Design a protein around this ligand. Sequence first.
Ligand SMILES: CC(C)=CCC/C(C)=C/CC/C(C)=C/CC/C(C)=C/COP(=O)(O)OP(=O)(O)O
Ligand SMILES: [Cl-]
Ligand SMILES: [Zn+2]
Lengths: 314, 346
Amino acid sequence: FLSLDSPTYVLYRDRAEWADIDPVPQNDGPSPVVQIIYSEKFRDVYDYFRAVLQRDERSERAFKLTRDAIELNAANYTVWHFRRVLLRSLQKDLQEEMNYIIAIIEEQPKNYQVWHHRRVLVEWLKDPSQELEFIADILNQDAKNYHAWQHRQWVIQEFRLWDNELQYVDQLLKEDVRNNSVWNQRHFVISNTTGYSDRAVLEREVQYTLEMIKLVPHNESAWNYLKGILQDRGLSRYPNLLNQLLDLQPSHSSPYLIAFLVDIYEDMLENQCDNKEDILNKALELCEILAKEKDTIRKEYWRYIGRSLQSKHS
Amino acid sequence: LDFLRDRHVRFFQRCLQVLPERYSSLETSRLTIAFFALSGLDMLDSLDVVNKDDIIEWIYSLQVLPTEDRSNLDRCGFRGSSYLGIPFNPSKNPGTAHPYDSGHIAMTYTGLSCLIILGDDLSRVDKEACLAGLRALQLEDGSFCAVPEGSENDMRFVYCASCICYMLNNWSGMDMKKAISYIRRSMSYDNGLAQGAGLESHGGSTFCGIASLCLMGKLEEVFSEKELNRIKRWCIMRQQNGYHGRPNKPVDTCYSFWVGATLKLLKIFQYTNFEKNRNYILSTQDRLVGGFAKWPDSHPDALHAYFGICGLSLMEESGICKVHPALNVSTRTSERLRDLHQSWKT
Ligand SMILES: CC(C)=CCC/C(C)=C/CC/C(C)=C/CC/C(C)=C/COP(=O)(O)OP(=O)(O)O
Ligand SMILES: [Cl-]
Ligand SMILES: [Zn+2]
C-alpha cells in the first residue's frame, strides 16, 4: 500500500491503526560491536516489526508491515519466515505471492532467503509450471548463477521435468561452450535419465564432447566432462580414444589434452598393461612437458606427479 | 607490492566499531563480521587493540539459552545480532521465551570461535543445549539447515556443524555417518565437491567437505587414494595466478584460502606457485582504507580482508600468524583450544 518513498508516507509511530502497539527497540547493551546506524524510517519499521513478532500477531497489518521490512532488508530470514507464517494464517493468495517473489529475485538474484522462499511456495502449490521459464530468464542475466542452477535441478527432479532439459543444455553450450555450469547440467540430465551404460549414449556423448573440444580446445569444462564419463569405466579400455587424442596433439593441443593422455597412460600402468616400463616413460615424458612448458604454473605439481609414477611402477 | 599490516589492523578495528546504514543487510550476521575482524586481528597479532571483555559480553548476549522449562532446546545456539529486541543479557539469567528466537548455525560457529579467540573458556556456554540445537538442524540426507524454522541446506552448514562439534569437543551434535555420506555424494564427475549431489563442484564447498572430514579425522577413511588424487587434481587446477572458485570463472582473493587451505589439507599446497598467488592477493589490497577486495581496484570488505590475509598466511607472509587450515583460526588459537579441551578432561 503506502510506499516507503511516497510523498505522503507516514511513520508507523504516527499511524492511527498502530496506536495500540508499543514499538520494541533493539538494544546492543553497553558496548555494541559492529553496530549499524539506522535512519529514522528504517528503525521505525523494524521497531514495529519486533513488536508484531514478539506477540506473534497474525494480522493483515502485520502482513503489510513485512513488505516494508523486506524492502529495507531482504536478507533478514526471520522476516521471511514470519511472512510465510502469515501467508498461511491469513490464507493469502499464493499465486500473488509468486508474482511478488518473482520480482524480488530478479532484483536480488544472489540472495539465499529469496530463493528459499520461492521453493517453499512451489512446494506448497505443487505447481512447477512457471519454474523452468523463470529460471531461464535469470540465467539469461547471469548464466552461472549458482542459486538458479540449484533451483532448476530441484524443480526438474521434484516434478520429473527431464523432457526438454538436454535440449536447453545444447542451446546454452552453443551460446558459451565454456560455461562450466551447463556442462554440469548436461551430466545431471543424462545420468538421471538414460545413464551412460548404454554404449550408444556413451558414444554419442564422447563424440559430442570431442566436437566441442575441436571448436575450443582450451576448455577445462569439456575435458573434465569427457574424462568424467569415462574415468570409472577405465580410460585404458578405449584404444581408439588414445589414438584419436594423439592425433589432436599436433594442432588442437592444450594442457588439458596432455593431462588426459597422462591419465590414460596411468590407467594402463594400473592395469598391468603391455610394455609397462615403456608406457611409464611416455607418461613421465608428458609430465615434464607440462611442467617445463605447457602448464608451468603447476610445474612443481607435475614434477610431483611424475615422481609418483616412477616410485609406483618400476 | 608490500603488505600494509598497520592499515589492515585499523581496517579491522573500524569493522568492530560503527557502520553506515548502507550495511543494514548485514544486521542478522553481525557476529560473523565480528569473527572476520577479531580473527583477522588475531592473525595479525593485534588483539590488544580491542577490549576483549566488552566483546565477550556482547557475544554472550547473543546466546539463545534454554528456558526454565527447557522446552526450547531444539532452538539453542547463537544469534547473529539482537535484531529481535530481546533484552540484553550476557548469558546470566535463564532464557526468556520468544516465539521466533533461535540460533543460526553459522552464528553458533562464529560465536564459539570468537569466544575462543578472545580467551574465554566457554564456561558460560550451555554446551548440551548447543549440541541439542545442532542435532535438530541435521536433515535426512545428512546435511544441515541454518535455523530450526527451516532454510536452505548445503555443504556450508555441514562445515559449521563440524566446527561446532570440534570446538565443543563432542560429536553428539551430529550423525557423523550421515554427514559423511552427504559429503561423499556431493563429489562431482569432475572430481571436485559441490554444495550437494548433482550440483556444480565449487572451491568453497570442496573446502567445506574436505575440512569437515579432517575435523572428524576421517579424510583417509572416506576417500580412497585414487579419489584423493582426483580431488587434488581438481583443486590445484583452480590456480590461474590467484585462485577461482570453479572452472572458467574469474579469480577472487578469497579462494586463495578456500582452495589453498584445501590443498594444504591434502598436503600439496607446497607444489603451487607462491609468487603469482601472493602477487594477485596483494593486487587486491586497498592501500588507502586497508583490507582486501575480491578483485583489484574493487571495494574491500571484512570477508575478503580476512581471507586474503589467511591466504597470505598459507605461504607464511612476514608478519602474519600461521592459520589452522581446517579450523579457520590461528594455530595459536587452535593450540589454546587444545589446552582448553585438556583442562575439561579432568
Ligand atoms: C567463516 C564463516 C563466516 C563461515 C564459514 C561457513 C561458510 C558459510 C562457508 C562458505 C564457503 C563457500 C565460499 C561456499 C561456496 C558457495 C557458493 C556456491 C557460492 C557462489 O558464489 P559466487 O559469487 O557465484 O561464486 P563465484 O563467482 O566465485 O564462483
Ligand atoms: Cl602442503
Ligand atoms: Zn570472494
